[PDB]
Amino acid sequence: CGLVASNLNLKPGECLRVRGEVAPDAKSFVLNLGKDSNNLCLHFNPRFNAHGDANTIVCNSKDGGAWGTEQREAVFPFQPGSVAEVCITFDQANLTVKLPDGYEFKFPNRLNLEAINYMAADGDFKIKCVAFD
Amino acid sequence: CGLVASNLNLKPGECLRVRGEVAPDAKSFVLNLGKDSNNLCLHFNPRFNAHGDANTIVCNSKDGGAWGTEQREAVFPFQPGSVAEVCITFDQANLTVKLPDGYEFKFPNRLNLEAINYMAADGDFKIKCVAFD
Numbered sequence: 020c021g022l023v024a025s026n027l028n029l030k031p032g033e034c035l036r037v038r039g040e041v042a043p044d045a046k047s048f049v050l051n052l053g054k055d056s057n058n059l060c061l062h063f064n065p066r067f068n069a070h071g072d073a074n075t076i077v078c079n080s081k082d083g084g085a086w087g088t089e090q091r092e093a094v095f096p097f098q099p100g101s102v103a104e105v106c107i108t109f110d111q112a113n114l115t116v117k118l119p120d121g122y123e124f125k126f127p128n129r130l131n132l133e134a135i136n137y138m139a140a141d142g143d144f145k146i147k148c149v150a151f152d
Numbered sequence: 153c154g155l156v157a158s159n160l161n162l163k164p165g166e167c168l169r170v171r172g173e174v175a176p177d178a179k180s181f182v183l184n185l186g187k188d189s190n191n192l193c194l195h196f197n198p199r200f201n202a203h204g205d206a207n208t209i210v211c212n213s214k215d216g217g218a219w220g221t222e223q224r225e226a227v228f229p230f231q232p233g234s235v236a237e238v239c240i241t242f243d244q245a246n247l248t249v250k251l252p253d254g255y256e257f258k259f260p261n262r263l264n265l266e267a268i269n270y271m272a273a274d275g276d277f278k279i280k281c282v283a284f285d
């Protein structure tokens with residue numbers, strides 16, 4: 020169970036940059052972002068080998084404690100036992116997740132959140148640096 | 153209230169770096185480090201002009217809700233309307249706080265925490281970057 024942070028006060032268009040170490044035995048890691056632990060506009064879950072998925076990013080939302088429908092992504096620029104940085108911005112319509120090696124995707128902001136105040140990391144990812152601008 | 157982070161798992165000898173923006177009319181700011189809001193190995197409180205103090209760093213501990221004996225440090229290398237970084241490490245005997253302009257001081261480690269797991273920021277300091285290394 021990894022870093023939990025609150026009172027982030029991230030506003031639309033502002034960049035949240037997260038750099039960490041992907042464990043050498045990595046199977047899965049998670050970054051959760053939202054209003055609080057029950058209201059997530061982004062559950063970001065790269066699965067190296069987990070829950071039947073191989074090298075697939077799965078995203079979801081959580082609204083008032085209820086998980087939404089999982090969305091699978093098309094790119095996977097992560098390797099076990101490496102450093103990786105993710106950069107996230109949002110607006111009320113979409114989150115934009117920028118990944119290593121120039122990859123990126125958008126995920127709809129199902130909560131239409133105008134501020135992100137909560138982040139939590141879990142799984143095979145050791146955070147080394149968080150930046151807010 | 154500003155950023156609150158938990159599960160930091162900062163081990164002895166590891167460096168926590170915190171960079172932020174000091175408000176142009178700053179009066180004071182606080183970084184609290186420890187186990188939780190009731191158990192702080194370091195309450196670090198630069199006062200530009202607050203509580204009768206001028207350009208003085210006030211430090212203390214808090215153990216089971218009880219404030220310890222305050223200490224006041226010798227140097228004040230902070231300026232309103234600037235960017236400032238602090239860097240903190242600890243061993244069993246002391247926390248070492250490294251300040252802008254190369255200044256550093258030690259504060260006794262009065263608690264027996266195996267790791268620093270909690271940070272909370274308050275006051276006239278906007279955190280821009282936190283690094284765990």
Ligand SMILES: Nc1cc(Cl)c(S(N)(=O)=O)cc1S(N)(=O)=O
Nearest residue numbers: 031032109110111112113132133
């Ligand atoms: N400023 C703004 C304008 C529009 Cl139009 C939209 S929307 N409705 O296309 O998502 C969102 C925003 S923001 N930056 O608050 O998320």
